[PDB]
Swiss-Prot record:
Family recorded in the similarity comment: Belongs to the GFP family.
Biotechnological and industrial applications of this entry: Green fluorescent protein has been engineered to produce a vast number of variously colored mutants, fusion proteins, and biosensors. Further generation of mutants led to more stable proteins (at 37 degrees Celsius for example) with brighter fluorescence and longer fluorescence lifetimes.
Effect in UniProt of substituting V220R: In Azurite; shifts the excitation and emission spectra to shorter wavelengths and increases quantum yields compared to BFP
Record's comment on post-translational modification: Contains a chromophore consisting of modified amino acid residues. Maturation of the chromophore requires nothing other than molecular oxygen.
Subunit structure: Monomer.
Gene3D superfamilies xref list: Green fluorescent protein (2.40.155.10)
Keyword Cell inner membrane recorded: no
Role played: Energy-transfer acceptor. Its role is to transduce the blue chemiluminescence of the protein aequorin into green fluorescent light by energy transfer. Fluoresces in vivo upon receiving energy from the Ca(2+)-activated photoprotein aequorin.
Organism listed in the record: Aequorea victoria
Effect of V64N: In R10-3; matures to the red-emitting state with excitation and emission maxima at 555 and 585 nm, respectively
Protein name: Green fluorescent protein
Effect of V172A: In mut2.1; shifts fluorescence lifetime from 3.03 to 2.50 ns
Phylogenetic classification of the source organism: Eukaryota, Metazoa, Cnidaria, Hydrozoa, Hydroidolina
Amino acid sequence: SKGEELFTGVVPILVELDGDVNGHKFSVRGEGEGDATNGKLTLKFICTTGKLPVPWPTLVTTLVLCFARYPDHMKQHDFFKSAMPEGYVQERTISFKDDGYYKTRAEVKFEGDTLVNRIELKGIDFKEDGNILGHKLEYNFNSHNAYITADKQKNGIKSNFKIRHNVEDGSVQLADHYQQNTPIGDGPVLLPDNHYLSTQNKLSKDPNEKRDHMVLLEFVTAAGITL
């Protein structure tokens, strides 16, 4: 696609999330950069409203799939870049087993030289003293893969995948994601054959940062279509 040309190099990223979970209002701002040539993303996120009232790991998937590395033989299946620079809407429901759910709406698009992900998140039905409101999840993130399918009726893609969040007591908290993406513009996009994205996330802290924050390194690689 033409949009892929915008991703030859490292591109600055801005992420802005406004959230409301069981009426708890919070905001997150992230900045960093991404390189689709190796699928590498590096960002630092800060909660600008104080302590983040949900666990950082539960926001990773919400907080830019246009930076996935699509191998040469798969570039005709990269919807995310094909929608750029005008961008796409990414919507999810994320259902936490035995607990509440998030609904998210985001726009991912260029503003100048910078790729911006701006999200509104609503969480409801979370349990008092549960893993989410109680912050009982380990500060880590399991590698995972997520399958992408075309949604030709909406000129977009859809994906369903589960995230396993480790709980402090050794149990697992599943987060079942249902995702839809649709282009913002009316130009042609690439609707893919079935494939998957392979994602790894390293979560860390900045020793000099006093605010509640998350340093994230992510690799995202497309796979599942042989030459």
